[PDB]
Ligand binder design. Sequence first.
Ligand SMILES: *[C@H](O)[C@H](C[C@@H]1CCNC1=O)NC(=O)[C@H](CC1CCCCC1)NC(=O)[C@@H](NC(=O)OCc1ccccc1)[C@@H](C)OC(C)(C)C
Ligand SMILES: *[C@H](O)[C@H](C[C@@H]1CCNC1=O)NC(=O)[C@H](CC1CCCCC1)NC(=O)[C@@H](NC(=O)OCc1ccccc1)[C@@H](C)OC(C)(C)C
Lengths: 300, 300
Amino acid sequence: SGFRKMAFPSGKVEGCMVQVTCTTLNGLWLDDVVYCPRHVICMLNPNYEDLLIRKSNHNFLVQAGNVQLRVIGHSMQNCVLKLKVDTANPKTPKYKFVRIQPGQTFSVLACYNGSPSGVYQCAMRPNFTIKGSFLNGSCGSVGFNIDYDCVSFCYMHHMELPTGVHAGTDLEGNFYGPFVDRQTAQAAGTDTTITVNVLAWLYAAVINGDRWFLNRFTTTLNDFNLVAMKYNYEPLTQDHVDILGPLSAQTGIAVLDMCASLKELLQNGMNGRTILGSALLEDEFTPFDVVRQCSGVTFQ
Amino acid sequence: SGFRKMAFPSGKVEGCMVQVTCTTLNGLWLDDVVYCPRHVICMLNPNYEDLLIRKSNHNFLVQAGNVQLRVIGHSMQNCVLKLKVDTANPKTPKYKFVRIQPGQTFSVLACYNGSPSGVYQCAMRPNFTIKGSFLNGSCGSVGFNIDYDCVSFCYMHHMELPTGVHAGTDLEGNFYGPFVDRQTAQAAGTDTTITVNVLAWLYAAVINGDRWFLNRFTTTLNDFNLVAMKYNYEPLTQDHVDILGPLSAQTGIAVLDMCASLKELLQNGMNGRTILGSALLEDEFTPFDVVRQCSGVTFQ
Ligand SMILES: *[C@H](O)[C@H](C[C@@H]1CCNC1=O)NC(=O)[C@H](CC1CCCCC1)NC(=O)[C@@H](NC(=O)OCc1ccccc1)[C@@H](C)OC(C)(C)C
Ligand SMILES: *[C@H](O)[C@H](C[C@@H]1CCNC1=O)NC(=O)[C@H](CC1CCCCC1)NC(=O)[C@@H](NC(=O)OCc1ccccc1)[C@@H](C)OC(C)(C)C
């Protein structure tokens, strides 16, 4: 028992990280292609089209530890640069490129100089930013889930916005949110709490023996949303009630009974008490994350 | 910028994990030896001495993915079993065996069936437990730090105590705390807050722009301890003031001024406000952890 913010093991992604110099940042070496942010080639308003067809293959140096990989092509796709290289990565995992939704979680492998430095669990926020830990040289760090032996790549790091929050692309080079890879003043809007994830984490607490917040009440979905939206929580949808069904059956607690417990917690506060050792209601675990951590792991 | 509970990248430890069956749990394959909990051979009060010299090498099966490693010797050291095998692990990292102190942090790679399932950051608690996430079959999961290219192994998982907290050994098979590998009623005592780590994390907050808790006051070490010990914080020692020196110089905030800010926070509470997005003062980052995350990572 116990519940922790757990990342995926990072070894499959570590063997894909390389350095790209044109600026220095990180690239993802899969098959015979290295993917990295196009901004490696720049700043207030660049035209990447020009700067790209203007480079040769010898104007990108790609380092896989000490080994120079020879660039034999360069293409752009959206905000991602693809460098074709002479050698297929012998440590290419089975992988997919996925675009995630706000509320979904993933692991970040933060890299510098093509070298892994740390791993942590993030969520795509409703305002399409992530609250990461990234410094100068982290661009090209990736986000991923593992499903069986399969790495699902969902995020590539491009920029920090004011207020210490992070923006980036899917691996097809498409930004999450309405941000652009230019050094004009952008800002993420006000964020929202991920209601479904908070309920998932209240179920994890009950599975782990932490029951004090349960009450004898029930609520309707509309009465629940009437309270939650006052505290800047996303409205709970029928589809969110449905994906909580498995955690509901496992625990014997109806989703709308857990809603009633969460309603009381928002209106009365915690009274200095904690849940799974937190004084705030956590929103960075999905229903799937709870089930993986509480049972799914034993089948590894 | 940004500050997250960051684990070390786990790839170097993933290539050392194997399954051991005699009971099934995890082993650590370094050089020609597999290390795992001796309790793999059991329950209320076993004598391991007997059960050990009573097994042959064919009574331990060691699986490295699909590959059977042949056992050619078995020795016991404290609460750890060492299985000598015919083959040196070709993915043995540069490594040390270290015993950590209460207050120090490490990464856990939680494994099932010899296969990695997740990574998270833990601290050795003053009561010599860890607050982990471990289920049936997790024994033999390890804790580690990385220093340069060098894995420092500090923890092997053996048991869960009541209240959902975890106990284990160093890699010489020596328990952290006064626990034994027998199924007699044991309990960890009341725990303590790691004062030095809370100050380290208040420095991380200031580095990351979160300044609202700073005040104009100072305190002596004795007046600070007089308050902190009322809130079940460890007394701050001169040695703890010394190891905060670098974070002090970087930020221009004197350690005893940060003590005065922490004093006010303990007596007045946060007023529902947060620091680095937490409503509790966090104690699971050391001074070193702060410096690694805020700058040290760029030199990877
Ligand atoms: C990749 O290594 C880095 C990662 C950054 C470094 C600091 N923290 C990170 O996550 N990426 C950058 O440094 C990028 C690079 C530019 C991106 C587009 C064009 C090519 C260069 N820059 C930033 O991330 C800046 N963000 C930004 O410019 O946002 C728009 C903006 C401009 C002016 C006012 C407000 C907003 C960062 C470095 O700037 C701030 C810290 C001021 C947000
Ligand atoms: C290794 O795979 C597992 C890991 C456990 C599984 C559940 N969570 C974990 O972290 N280890 C165990 O299952 C061990 C194995 C025994 C250890 C010593 C002798 C050989 C078998 N058992 C436990 O971890 C139990 N803890 C325990 O027995 O503590 C002493 C005790 C006894 C009676 C009352 C109070 C305390 C767990 C499974 O028991 C409790 C969950 C009741 C604490």
